[PDB]
Design an enzyme around this catalytic site. Structure first.
Site, PDB file in Angstrom:
ATOM      1  N   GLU A   1      34.332  34.099  44.088  1.00 15.98           N
ATOM      2  CA  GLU A   1      35.628  33.714  43.647  1.00 15.98           C
ATOM      3  C   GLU A   1      36.614  33.419  44.968  1.00 15.98           C
ATOM      4  O   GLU A   1      37.745  33.586  44.986  1.00 15.98           O
ATOM      5  CB  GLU A   1      36.413  34.789  43.162  1.00 15.98           C
ATOM      6  CG  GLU A   1      36.152  35.271  41.651  1.00 15.98           C
ATOM      7  CD  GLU A   1      36.408  36.576  41.199  1.00 15.98           C
ATOM      8  OE1 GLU A   1      37.330  37.304  41.657  1.00 15.98           O
ATOM      9  OE2 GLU A   1      35.803  37.144  40.131  1.00 15.98           O
TER      10      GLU A   1
ATOM     11  N   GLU B   1      30.829  36.700  35.457  1.00 17.66           N
ATOM     12  CA  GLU B   1      31.571  37.535  35.176  1.00 17.66           C
ATOM     13  C   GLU B   1      32.129  37.241  33.933  1.00 17.66           C
ATOM     14  O   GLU B   1      32.620  36.135  34.031  1.00 17.66           O
ATOM     15  CB  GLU B   1      32.448  37.936  36.338  1.00 17.66           C
ATOM     16  CG  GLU B   1      32.002  38.732  37.498  1.00 17.66           C
ATOM     17  CD  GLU B   1      33.294  39.133  38.429  1.00 17.66           C
ATOM     18  OE1 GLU B   1      34.329  39.250  37.838  1.00 17.66           O
ATOM     19  OE2 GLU B   1      33.172  39.394  39.605  1.00 17.66           O
TER      20      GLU B   1
END
Ligand SMILES: OC[C@H]1O[C@H](OC[C@H]2O[C@@H](O[C@H]3[C@H](O)[C@H](O)[C@H](O[C@H]4[C@H](O)[C@H](O)[C@H](O)O[C@@H]4CO)O[C@@H]3CO)[C@@H](O)[C@@H](O)[C@@H]2O[C@@H]2O[C@H](CO)[C@@H](O)[C@H](O)[C@@H]2O)[C@H](O)[C@@H](O)[C@H]1O
Ligand SMILES: [Ca+2]
Ligand SMILES: [Cl-]
Length: 325
Positions: A165, A255
């Site tokens: 991320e 995710e």
């Protein structure tokens, strides 16, 4: 047709098991989606056990987190104790790992965090030779390479997803793209120095962030993390954007939580290589507590998982072939 997907792992001399896992994933591309759960926090398969008790099936991939490098080894967390990982691999499941890289909140702190709001750890200093920050990250990499070598020693390949991320800019490693890519290269080259040839490298994209891409020499698979997105058309738009951005790489939903059901996503055209639901701390931290049975779950509940496993395109653990010799 999976001909655009590169055929070899970026790692020279990748382990026999890692090549088998990668080849199988490449063969599944566009046809099947693997199921996956996250550990409850770090080092257990509690969420896989929960899914089985909700559905009767196990996810294909179980993921672990090496976040607790500062405390390990310790009585409550010891990454040398790899039995939880071996047991899952020997039961026929695939092994993944990510890494919330925890660093001191401030100089000489005994508290360790990863979000920029909670630590002043400076990546620019971390890349300068011999600074306090540099010695910290080098010692972490040295310790983590040791832990991962225990799995390489056992011939267990790892679908490996560090430094995730990045372009969301909320972790300390997301200060700027240029230092981020230097840090990824440093991790990759350190792990190569230590002989870790059992890793399949997953780089997590925020979409439209090619300037943060570490490069083909250091990445095998592209990941996407998505929370609170219930439009299946939206998820397929993200999937197709990543496909256009990296035409030679598998794209996974690395995710997710509170997302459209897999049947809606597949119908919309989002054919992820796999999906992994995040963990619900209070529900799965203790497999013997009454809450473990409720079926409620903050990221994907019993209904969501029963829907996913009712889809032809979804692979559970028992559907996997053998990745051993
Ligand atoms: O040793 C230094 C560390 O100490 C602290 O963590 C230990 C503590 O972890 C607890 O789980 C936490 C975890 O620390 C993360 O904060 C996690 O963040 C997640 C977010 O919630 C969110 O889900 C996000 O998307 O993803 C994040 C990454 O997972 O949250 C969980 C839940 O709050 C938990 O495991 C504790 O048990 C553990 O503390 C130990 O507990 C045992 C007994 O249970 C004791 O014997 C030990 O002495 C420990 O106290 C600190 O938070 C870390 O950052 C780090 O400083
Ligand atoms: Ca340690
Ligand atoms: Cl199963």
């Amino acid at each position: 047709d999976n001909s655009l997907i590169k055929k070899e792992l970026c790692t020279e001399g990748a382990s026999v098991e890692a090549k088998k896992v990668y080849t199988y994933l490449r063969n599944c591309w566009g046809r099947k989606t693997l199921s996956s759960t996250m550990a409850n926090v770090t080092w257990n398969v509690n969420e896989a056990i929960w899914v089985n008790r909700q559905t009767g099936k196990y996810p294909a991939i179980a993921c672990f987190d090496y976040m607790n490098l500062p405390a390990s080894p310790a009585d409550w967390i010891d990454y040398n104790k790899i039995s939880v990982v071996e047991d899952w691999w020997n039961a026929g499941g695939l092994v993944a790992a990510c890494w919330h890289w925890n660093v001191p909140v401030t100089e000489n702190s005994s508290e360790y965090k990863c979000m920029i709001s909670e630590t002043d750890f400076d990546i620019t200093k971390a890349l300068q030779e011999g600074t306090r920050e540099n010695e910290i990250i080098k010692a972490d990499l040295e310790e983590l390479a040791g832990y991962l070598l225990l799995l390489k020693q056992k011939n267990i390949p790892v679908i490996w997803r560090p430094l995730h991320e990045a372009a969301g800019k909320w972790f300390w490693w997301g200060k700027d793209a240029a230092s981020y890519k230097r840090l990824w290269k440093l991790v990759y080259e350190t792990f190569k120095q230590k002989g870790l040839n059992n890793l399949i490298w997953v780089w997590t994209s925020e979409t439209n962030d090619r300037d943060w891409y570490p490069g083909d020499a250091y990445v095998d698979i592209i990941g996407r993390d998505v929370y609170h997105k219930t439009s299946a058309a939206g998820l397929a738009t993200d999937f197709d954007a990543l496909k256009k951005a990296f035409p030679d790489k598998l794209i996974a939903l690395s995710e997710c939580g509170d997302v459209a059901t897999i049947d809606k996503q597949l119908a919309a055209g989002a054919q992820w290589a796999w999906f992994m639901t995040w963990y619900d701390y209070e529900v799965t931290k203790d497999t013997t507590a009454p809450v473990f049975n409720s079926g409620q779950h903050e990221h994907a509940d019993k209904a969501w998982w029963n829907n996913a496993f009712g889809q032809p395109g979804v692979i559970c653990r028992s559907d996997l072939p053998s990745f051993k010799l």
